[PDB]
């Protein structure tokens, strides 16, 4: 008992001081972002690892080092057209300012007449999504290894007044050591107080988002619950062929658990997936600590997860640099840069 009360009552002082120093580092790069730290022709383009609304992420090779990265290429023109300037600007501004062991590191970013570019660390493990579906589901200890990384990641982002808004296996890359690197900060926003945009993945949307209520940090804790349920079950708690059926399941107030879920899991999950904001874990007087101290996390050495001293229960096949076996195949499109600058004013700060 008493050794864990000196350990617990001291871990917390280290954490209060870690976070303060993290808020300073973040604020420095947030009030003064790095711009134009590379150029397109410095990388060879090999293969598409993924796509989104305005372009794609590609495996690329930096010719001076031969280091492989993942480059996100967005077409400025489609961004303007879809009225997402602000969201694309938040994404880069936030990635370039953040810093944590489970956040994808942004190395360089730049722009040319046509496109925006973000060059990030390559995670050759591919997305959690891909191994979750292949295998069916993860065991609770396997799910918990991942969940703990998400819990601390949000503790970080929320301390920075950030909200992530797109938790789901698709956005959780697996690195060479089997740990998580969260990507796709397209929906992230720095915010004190309330925000209103209806966005996110249907399955992971919190009720107060569906109901146009105006919402905060807490929608991320709802999402953590959806993630832990999907990881542990092989399917999400709310699904259906049409989104409008998903939304009504989410607001009904009601969830069913597989017979294989432990009681501790079910109880952690009943408190994350709580419609009543006064009752949802992550959102009470004690905050994240209600989740950390929950019985399901009894085996979790929170400090050892931060320091990556715990064994990943799943280290992927690593067939050397520049290999993409852990990724799906996509149609390739040639990158075309124009001789005319598009949307210069709209993207000045990028």
């Amino acid at each position: 008992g008493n050794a864990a009360a000196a350990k617990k009552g001291s871990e917390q002082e280290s954490v209060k001081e870690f976070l303060a120093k993290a808020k300073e580092d973040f604020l420095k790069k947030w009030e003064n972002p790095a711009q134009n730290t590379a150029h397109l022709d410095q990388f060879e383009r090999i293969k598409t690892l993924g796509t989104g609304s305005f372009g794609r992420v590609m495996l690329v090779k930096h010719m001076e080092t031969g280091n492989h990265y993942a480059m996100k290429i967005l077409d400025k023109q489609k961004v303007v057209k879809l009225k997402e300037i602000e969201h694309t600007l938040n994404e880069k501004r936030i990635l370039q300012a953040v810093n944590f062991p489970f956040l994808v590191k942004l190395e360089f970013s730049f722009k040319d007449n046509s496109n925006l570019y973000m060059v990030m660390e390559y995670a050759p493990g591919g997305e959690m999504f891909s191994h979750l579906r292949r295998i069916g589901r993860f065991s609770e200890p396997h799910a918990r290894f991942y969940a703990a990384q998400i819990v601390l990641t949000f503790e970080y982002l929320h301390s920075l007044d950030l909200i992530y808004r797109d938790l789901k296996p698709e956005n959780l890359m697996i690195d060479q050591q089997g740990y998580i690197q969260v990507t796709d900060f397209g929906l992230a926003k720095r915010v004190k107080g309330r925000t209103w945009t209806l966005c996110g993945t249907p399955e992971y949307l919190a009720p107060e988002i569906i109901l146009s209520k105006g919402y905060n940090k807490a929608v991320d804790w709802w999402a953590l619950g959806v993630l832990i349920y999907e990881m542990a079950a092989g399917y999400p708690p709310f699904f259906a062929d049409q989104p409008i059926q998903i939304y009504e399941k989410i607001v009904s107030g009601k969830v069913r658990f597989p017979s294989h879920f432990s009681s501790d899991l079910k109880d952690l999950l009943r408190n994350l997936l709580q419609v009543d904001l006064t009752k949802r874990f992550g959102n009470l007087k004690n905050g994240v600590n209600d989740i950390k101290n929950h019985k399901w996390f009894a085996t979790t050495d929170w400090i050892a997860i931060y320091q990556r001293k715990v064994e990943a229960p799943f280290i992927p096949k690593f067939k050397g640099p520049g290999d993409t076996s852990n990724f799906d195949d996509y149609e390739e499109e040639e990158i075309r840069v124009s001789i005319n600058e598009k949307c210069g004013k709209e993207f000045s700060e990028f």
């Binding site: 879809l82 997402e84 969201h87 999504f129 579906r133 069916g136 797109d166 789901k168 698709e170 397209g186 929906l187 945009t197 209806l198 966005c199 996110g200 993945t201 249907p202 399955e203 079950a233 092989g234 399917y235 699904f239 259906a240 062929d241 989104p243 069913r256 597989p258 799906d328």
Partner: peptide, 20 residues
């Protein structure tokens, strides 16, 4: 079972976010 209902649905693929 709930797992067969899921596998037979159209939400087992890579999922896109919305923007209302």
């Amino acid at each position: 079972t709930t797992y067969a209902d899921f596998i037979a649905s159209g939400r087992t693929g890579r999922r896109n976010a919305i923007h209302d």
